[PDB]
Short mmCIF file of C-alpha atoms and ligand atoms in Angstrom, two decimals:
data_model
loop_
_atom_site.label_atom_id
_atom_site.label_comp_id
_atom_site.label_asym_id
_atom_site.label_seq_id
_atom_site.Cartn_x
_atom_site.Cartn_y
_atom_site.Cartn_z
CA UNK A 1 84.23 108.75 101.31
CA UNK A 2 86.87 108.43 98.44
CA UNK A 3 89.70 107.54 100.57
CA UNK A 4 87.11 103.99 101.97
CA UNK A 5 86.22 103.68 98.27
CA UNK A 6 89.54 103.25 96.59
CA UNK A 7 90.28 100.28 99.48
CA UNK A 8 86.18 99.25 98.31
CA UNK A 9 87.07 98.75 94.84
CA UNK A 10 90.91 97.51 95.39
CA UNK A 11 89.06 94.66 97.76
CA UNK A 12 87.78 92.82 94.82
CA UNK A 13 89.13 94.89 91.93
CA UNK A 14 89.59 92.09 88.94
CA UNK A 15 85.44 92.33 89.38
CA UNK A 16 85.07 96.04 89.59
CA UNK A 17 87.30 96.52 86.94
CA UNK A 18 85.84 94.50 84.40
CA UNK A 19 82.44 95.56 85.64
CA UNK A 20 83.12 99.22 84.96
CA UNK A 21 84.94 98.97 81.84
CA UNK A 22 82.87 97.17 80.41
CA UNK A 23 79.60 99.81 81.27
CA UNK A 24 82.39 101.88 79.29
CA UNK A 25 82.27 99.72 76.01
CA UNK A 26 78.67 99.50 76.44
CA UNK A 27 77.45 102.73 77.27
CA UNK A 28 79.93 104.40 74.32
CA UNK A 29 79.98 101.70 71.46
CA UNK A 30 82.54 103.56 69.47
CA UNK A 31 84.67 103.49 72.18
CA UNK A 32 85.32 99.46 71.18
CA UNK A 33 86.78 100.57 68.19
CA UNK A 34 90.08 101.48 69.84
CA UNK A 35 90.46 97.88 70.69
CA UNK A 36 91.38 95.40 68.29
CA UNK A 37 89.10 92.38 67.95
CA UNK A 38 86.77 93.63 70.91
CA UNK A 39 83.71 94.05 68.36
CA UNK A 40 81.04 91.90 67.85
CA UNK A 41 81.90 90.35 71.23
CA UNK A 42 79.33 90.00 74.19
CA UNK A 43 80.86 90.86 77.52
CA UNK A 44 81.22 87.20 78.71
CA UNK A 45 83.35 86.96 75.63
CA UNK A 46 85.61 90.16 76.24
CA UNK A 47 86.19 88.82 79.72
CA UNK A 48 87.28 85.13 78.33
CA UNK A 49 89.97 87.00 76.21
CA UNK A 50 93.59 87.74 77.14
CA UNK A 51 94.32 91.26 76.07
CA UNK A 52 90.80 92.37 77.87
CA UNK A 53 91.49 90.77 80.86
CA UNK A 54 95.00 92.09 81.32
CA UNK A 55 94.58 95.69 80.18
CA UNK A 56 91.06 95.81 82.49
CA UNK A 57 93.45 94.97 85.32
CA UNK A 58 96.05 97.89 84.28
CA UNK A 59 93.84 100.55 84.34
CA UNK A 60 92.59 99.96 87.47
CA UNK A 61 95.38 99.12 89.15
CA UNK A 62 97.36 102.68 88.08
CA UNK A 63 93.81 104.47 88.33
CA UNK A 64 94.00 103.82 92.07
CA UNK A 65 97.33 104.66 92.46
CA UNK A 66 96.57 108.28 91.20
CA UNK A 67 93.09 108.32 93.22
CA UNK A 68 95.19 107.45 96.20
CA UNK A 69 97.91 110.29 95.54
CA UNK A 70 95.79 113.16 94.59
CA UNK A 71 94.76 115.86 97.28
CA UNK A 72 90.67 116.60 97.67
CA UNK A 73 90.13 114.70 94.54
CA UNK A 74 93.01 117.08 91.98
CA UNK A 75 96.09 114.40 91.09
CA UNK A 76 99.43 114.71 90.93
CA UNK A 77 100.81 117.19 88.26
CA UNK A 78 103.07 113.98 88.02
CA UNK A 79 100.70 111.06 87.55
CA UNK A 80 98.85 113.25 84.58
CA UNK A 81 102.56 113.53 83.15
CA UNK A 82 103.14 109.80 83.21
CA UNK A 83 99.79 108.86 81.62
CA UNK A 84 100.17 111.39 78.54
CA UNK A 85 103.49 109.79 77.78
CA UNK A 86 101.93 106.08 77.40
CA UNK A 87 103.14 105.03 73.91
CA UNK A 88 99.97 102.98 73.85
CA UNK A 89 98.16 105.88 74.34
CA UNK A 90 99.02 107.60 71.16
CA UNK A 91 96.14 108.24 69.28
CA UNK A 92 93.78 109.41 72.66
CA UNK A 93 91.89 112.48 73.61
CA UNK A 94 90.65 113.58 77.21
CA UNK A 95 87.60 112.80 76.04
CA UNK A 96 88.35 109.01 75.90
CA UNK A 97 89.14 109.92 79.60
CA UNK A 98 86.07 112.40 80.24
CA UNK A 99 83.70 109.17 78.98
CA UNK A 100 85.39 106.40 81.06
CA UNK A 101 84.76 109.41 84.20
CA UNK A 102 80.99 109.13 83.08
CA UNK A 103 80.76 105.62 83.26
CA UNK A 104 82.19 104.89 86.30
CA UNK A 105 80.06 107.50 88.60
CA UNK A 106 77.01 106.09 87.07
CA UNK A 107 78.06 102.93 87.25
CA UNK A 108 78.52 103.54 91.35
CA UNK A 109 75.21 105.15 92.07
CA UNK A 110 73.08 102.64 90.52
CA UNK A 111 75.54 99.35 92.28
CA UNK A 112 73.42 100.46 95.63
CA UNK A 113 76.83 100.73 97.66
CA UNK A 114 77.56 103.80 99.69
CA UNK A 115 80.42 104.94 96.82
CA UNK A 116 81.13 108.61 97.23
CA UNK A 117 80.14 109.00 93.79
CA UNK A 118 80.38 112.87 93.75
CA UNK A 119 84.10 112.85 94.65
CA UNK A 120 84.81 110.17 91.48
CA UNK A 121 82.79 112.95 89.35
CA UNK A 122 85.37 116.15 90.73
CA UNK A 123 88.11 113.40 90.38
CA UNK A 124 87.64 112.55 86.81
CA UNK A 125 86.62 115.88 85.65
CA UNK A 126 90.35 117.12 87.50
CA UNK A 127 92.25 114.43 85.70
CA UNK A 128 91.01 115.33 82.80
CA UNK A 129 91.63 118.94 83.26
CA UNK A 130 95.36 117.53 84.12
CA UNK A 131 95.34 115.86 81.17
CA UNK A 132 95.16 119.01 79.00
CA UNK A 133 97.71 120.72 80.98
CA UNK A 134 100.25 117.66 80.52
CA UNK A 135 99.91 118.19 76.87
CA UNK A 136 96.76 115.67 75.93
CA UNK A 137 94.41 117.31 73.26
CA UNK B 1 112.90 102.37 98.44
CA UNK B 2 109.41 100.75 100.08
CA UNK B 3 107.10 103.13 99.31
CA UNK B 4 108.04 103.07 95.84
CA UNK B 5 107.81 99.29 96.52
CA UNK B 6 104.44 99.53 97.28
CA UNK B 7 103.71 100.98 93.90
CA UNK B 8 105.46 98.58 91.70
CA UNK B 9 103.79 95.93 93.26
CA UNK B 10 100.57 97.30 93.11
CA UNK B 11 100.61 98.35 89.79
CA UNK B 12 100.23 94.67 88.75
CA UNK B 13 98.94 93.11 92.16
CA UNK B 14 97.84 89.79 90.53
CA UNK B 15 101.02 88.72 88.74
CA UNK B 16 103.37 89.62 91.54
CA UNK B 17 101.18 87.98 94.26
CA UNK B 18 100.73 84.73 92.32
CA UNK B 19 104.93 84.55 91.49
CA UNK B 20 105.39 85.38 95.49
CA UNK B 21 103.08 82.57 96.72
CA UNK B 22 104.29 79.95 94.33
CA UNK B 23 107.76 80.92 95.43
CA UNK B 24 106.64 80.66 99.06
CA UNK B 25 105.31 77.05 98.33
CA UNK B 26 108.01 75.83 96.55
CA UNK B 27 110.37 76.87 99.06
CA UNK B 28 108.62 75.56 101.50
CA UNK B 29 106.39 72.75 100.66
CA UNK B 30 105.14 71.83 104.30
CA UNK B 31 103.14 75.02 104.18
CA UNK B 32 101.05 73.18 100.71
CA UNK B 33 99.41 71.26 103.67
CA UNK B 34 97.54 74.76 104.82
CA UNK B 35 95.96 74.92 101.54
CA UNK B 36 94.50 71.72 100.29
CA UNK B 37 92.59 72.81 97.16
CA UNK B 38 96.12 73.40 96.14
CA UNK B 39 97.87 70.04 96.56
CA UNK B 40 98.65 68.06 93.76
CA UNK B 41 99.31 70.34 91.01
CA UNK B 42 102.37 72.45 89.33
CA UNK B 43 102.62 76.24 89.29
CA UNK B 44 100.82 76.34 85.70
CA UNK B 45 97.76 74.36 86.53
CA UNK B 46 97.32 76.83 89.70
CA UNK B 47 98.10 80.06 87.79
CA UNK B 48 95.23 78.41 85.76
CA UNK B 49 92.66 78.62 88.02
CA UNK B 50 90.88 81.73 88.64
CA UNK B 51 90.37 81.01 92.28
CA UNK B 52 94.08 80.59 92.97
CA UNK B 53 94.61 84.02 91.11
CA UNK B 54 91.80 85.39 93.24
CA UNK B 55 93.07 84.20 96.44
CA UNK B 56 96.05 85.50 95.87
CA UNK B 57 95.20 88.79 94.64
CA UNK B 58 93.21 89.37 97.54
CA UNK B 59 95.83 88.68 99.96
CA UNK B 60 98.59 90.47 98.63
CA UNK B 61 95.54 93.21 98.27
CA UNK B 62 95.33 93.42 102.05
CA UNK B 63 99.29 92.88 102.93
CA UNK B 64 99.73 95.90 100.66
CA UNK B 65 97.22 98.19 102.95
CA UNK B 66 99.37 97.39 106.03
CA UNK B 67 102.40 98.06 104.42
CA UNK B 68 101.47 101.10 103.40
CA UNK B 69 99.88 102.26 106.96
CA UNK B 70 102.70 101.22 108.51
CA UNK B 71 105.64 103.60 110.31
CA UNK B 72 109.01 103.53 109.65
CA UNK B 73 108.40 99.67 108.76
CA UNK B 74 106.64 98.92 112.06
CA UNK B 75 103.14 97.91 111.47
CA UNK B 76 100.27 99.53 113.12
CA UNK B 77 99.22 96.90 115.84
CA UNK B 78 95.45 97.14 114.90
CA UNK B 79 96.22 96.02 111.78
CA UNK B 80 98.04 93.27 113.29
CA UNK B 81 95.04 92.38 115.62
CA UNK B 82 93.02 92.33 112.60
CA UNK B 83 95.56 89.27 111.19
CA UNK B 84 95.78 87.13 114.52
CA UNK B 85 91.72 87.49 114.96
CA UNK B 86 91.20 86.31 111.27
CA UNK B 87 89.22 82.92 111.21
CA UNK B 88 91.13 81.48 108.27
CA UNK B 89 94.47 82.56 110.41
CA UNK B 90 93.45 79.92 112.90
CA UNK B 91 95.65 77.41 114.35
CA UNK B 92 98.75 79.79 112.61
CA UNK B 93 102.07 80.48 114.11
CA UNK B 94 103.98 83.16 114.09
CA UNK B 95 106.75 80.98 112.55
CA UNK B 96 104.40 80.34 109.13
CA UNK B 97 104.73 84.04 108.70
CA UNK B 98 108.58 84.82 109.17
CA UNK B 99 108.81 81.76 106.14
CA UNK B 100 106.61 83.45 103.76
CA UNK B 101 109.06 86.58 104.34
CA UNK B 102 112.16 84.49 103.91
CA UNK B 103 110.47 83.55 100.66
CA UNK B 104 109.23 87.00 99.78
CA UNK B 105 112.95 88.71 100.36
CA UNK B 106 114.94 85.71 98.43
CA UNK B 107 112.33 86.93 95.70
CA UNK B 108 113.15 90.68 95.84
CA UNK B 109 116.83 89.83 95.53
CA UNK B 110 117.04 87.45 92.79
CA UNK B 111 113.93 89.71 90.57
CA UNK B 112 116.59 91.88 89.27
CA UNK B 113 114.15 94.57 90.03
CA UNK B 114 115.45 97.70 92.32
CA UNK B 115 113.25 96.66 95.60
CA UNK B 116 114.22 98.12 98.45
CA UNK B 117 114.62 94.07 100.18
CA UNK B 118 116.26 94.90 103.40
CA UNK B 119 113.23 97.36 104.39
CA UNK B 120 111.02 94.24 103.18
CA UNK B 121 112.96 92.10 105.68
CA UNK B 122 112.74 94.59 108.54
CA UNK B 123 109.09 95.18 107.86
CA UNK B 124 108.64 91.38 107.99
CA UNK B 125 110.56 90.88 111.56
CA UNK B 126 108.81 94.02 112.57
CA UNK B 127 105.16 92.38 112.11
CA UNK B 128 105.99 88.97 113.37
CA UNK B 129 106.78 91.15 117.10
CA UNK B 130 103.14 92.87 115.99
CA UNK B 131 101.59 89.49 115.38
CA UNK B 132 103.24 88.26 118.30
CA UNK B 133 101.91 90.89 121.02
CA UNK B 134 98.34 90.67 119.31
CA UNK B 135 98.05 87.37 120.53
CA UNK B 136 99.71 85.01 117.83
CA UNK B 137 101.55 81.92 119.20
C1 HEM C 201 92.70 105.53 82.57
C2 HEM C 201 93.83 104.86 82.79
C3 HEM C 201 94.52 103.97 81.73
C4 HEM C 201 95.63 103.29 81.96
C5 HEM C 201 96.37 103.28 83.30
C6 HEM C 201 95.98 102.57 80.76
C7 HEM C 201 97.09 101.76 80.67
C8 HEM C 201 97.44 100.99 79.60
C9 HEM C 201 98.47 99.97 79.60
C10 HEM C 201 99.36 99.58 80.80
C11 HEM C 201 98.54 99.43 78.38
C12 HEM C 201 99.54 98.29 78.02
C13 HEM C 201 99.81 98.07 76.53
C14 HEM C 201 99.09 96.83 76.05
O1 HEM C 201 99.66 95.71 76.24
O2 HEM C 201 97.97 96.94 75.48
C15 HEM C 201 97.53 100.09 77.56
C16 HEM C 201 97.22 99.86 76.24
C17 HEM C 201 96.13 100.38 75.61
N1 HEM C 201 95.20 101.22 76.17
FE1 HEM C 201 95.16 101.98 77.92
N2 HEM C 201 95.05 102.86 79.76
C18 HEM C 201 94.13 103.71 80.35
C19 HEM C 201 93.03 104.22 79.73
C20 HEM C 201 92.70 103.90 78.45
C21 HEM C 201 91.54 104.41 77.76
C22 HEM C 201 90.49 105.38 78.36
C23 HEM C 201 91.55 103.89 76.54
C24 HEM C 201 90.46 104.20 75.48
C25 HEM C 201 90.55 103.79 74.21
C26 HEM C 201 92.73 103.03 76.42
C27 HEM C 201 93.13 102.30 75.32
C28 HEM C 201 94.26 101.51 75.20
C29 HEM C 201 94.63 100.81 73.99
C30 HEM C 201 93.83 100.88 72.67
C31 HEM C 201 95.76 100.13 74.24
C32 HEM C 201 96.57 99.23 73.28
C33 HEM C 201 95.85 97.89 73.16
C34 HEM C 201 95.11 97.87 71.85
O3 HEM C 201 95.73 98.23 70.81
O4 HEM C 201 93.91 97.51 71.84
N3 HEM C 201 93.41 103.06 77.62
N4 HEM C 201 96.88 101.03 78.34
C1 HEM C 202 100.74 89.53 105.80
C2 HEM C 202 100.48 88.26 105.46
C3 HEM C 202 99.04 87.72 105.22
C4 HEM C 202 97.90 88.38 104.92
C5 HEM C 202 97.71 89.89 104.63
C6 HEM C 202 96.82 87.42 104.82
C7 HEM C 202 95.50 87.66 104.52
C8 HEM C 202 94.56 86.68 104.24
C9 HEM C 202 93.24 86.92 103.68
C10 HEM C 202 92.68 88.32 103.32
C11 HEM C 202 92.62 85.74 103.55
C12 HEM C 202 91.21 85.51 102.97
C13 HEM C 202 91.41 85.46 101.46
C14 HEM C 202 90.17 85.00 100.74
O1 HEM C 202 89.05 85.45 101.13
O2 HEM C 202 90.33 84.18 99.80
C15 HEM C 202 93.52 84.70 104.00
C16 HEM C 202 93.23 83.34 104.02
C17 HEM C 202 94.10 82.33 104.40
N1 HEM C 202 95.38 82.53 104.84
FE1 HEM C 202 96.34 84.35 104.96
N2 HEM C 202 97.35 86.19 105.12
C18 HEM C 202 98.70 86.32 105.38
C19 HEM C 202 99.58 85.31 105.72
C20 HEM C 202 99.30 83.96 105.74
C21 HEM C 202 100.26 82.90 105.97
C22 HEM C 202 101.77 83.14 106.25
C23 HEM C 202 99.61 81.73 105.94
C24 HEM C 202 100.13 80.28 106.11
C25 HEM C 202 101.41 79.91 106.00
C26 HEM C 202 98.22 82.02 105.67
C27 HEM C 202 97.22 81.07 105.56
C28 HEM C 202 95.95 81.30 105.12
C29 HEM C 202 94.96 80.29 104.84
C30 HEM C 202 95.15 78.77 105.02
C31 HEM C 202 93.85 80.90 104.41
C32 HEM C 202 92.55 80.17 104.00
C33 HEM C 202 92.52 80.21 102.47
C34 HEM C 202 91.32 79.47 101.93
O3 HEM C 202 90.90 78.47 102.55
O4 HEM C 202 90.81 79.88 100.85
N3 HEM C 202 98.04 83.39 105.56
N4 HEM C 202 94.70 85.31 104.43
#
């Protein structure tokens, strides 16, 4: 379930992380426009270049974090807090959020692993909700 | 203190398990001999490679699950079984592990970060009992 899948991805999570982000950037192409110098780049590129590789690697690493202290899938008042306050944030929406959500359940149920992809679904729709309580338009 | 720990680490896995092992190394270079695709070469031509970051990442991946299931400090002796019955753990000591804590604690202290190193130390005596009562010589 979603408890075995957040030790799944953290097992080899430089891959998934990349992986997933970058069915992000693919599946929303105006999403790449938020990132400085990620257009007109293939994905072998993007994962050659610095900034990619380390931010890829930040995500993931705090996203687990808050998969690992929410309750039945609904995070901590506390983690939405801390993620609305980024200063690198500044110009986001939930629905930056709501997309990256999208991407990553459908990314899971076509890999062919036994990812509880309907939990990731309630847990990204929950963060965002979070995320608009915390004060994220 | 170390669950807190546990999240500061985690939240950039890679970077903190690569400065740990090179301090572990360098400390102690008659552990190098355990790992010969690492012989011969300074810290910057290993952080280089992406198989030393991977190894690494991995590890520290898996040290930070048994921290975090363990009580009071005292690891859970399955997980300790799990460490002695490990193929690439063959031919270990229990001695190799008390170093790399040695290593891991002078690294808290001198960080200048607020870790919590004396739990760190009693977690490490703790699992070299663990290790030694699943079977580790
Ligand atoms: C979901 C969890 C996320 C976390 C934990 C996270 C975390 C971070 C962190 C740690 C940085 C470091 C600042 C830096 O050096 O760039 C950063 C920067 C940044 N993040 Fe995120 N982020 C998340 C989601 C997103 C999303 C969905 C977007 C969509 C656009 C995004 C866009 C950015 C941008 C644009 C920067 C600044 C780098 C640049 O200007 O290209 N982040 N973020
Ligand atoms: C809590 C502490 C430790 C944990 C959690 C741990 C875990 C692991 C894991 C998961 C691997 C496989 C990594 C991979 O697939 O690349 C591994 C490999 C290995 N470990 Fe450890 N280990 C620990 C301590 C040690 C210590 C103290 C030593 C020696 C001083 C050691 C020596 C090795 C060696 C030689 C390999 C083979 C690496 C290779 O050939 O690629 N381990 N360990």
């Amino acid at each position: 379930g979603f408890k075995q899948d957040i030790a799944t991805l953290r097992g080899d999570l430089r891959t998934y992380a990349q992986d997933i982000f970058l069915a992000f950037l693919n599946k929303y192409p105006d999403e790449k426009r938020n990132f400085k110098n990620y257009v007109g780049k293939s994905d072998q590129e993007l994962k050659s270049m610095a900034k990619f590789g380390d931010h890829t690697e930040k995500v993931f690493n705090l996203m687990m974090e808050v998969a690992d202290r929410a309750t039945d899938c609904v995070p901590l008042a506390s983690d939405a807090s801390t993620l609305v306050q980024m200063k690198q944030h500044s110009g986001l929406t939930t629905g930056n959020f709501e997309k990256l959500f999208v991407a990553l359940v459908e990314y899971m149920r076509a890999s062919g692993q036994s990812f509880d992809s309907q939990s990731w679904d309630r847990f990204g729709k929950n963060l965002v909700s979070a995320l608009s309580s915390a004060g994220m338009k």
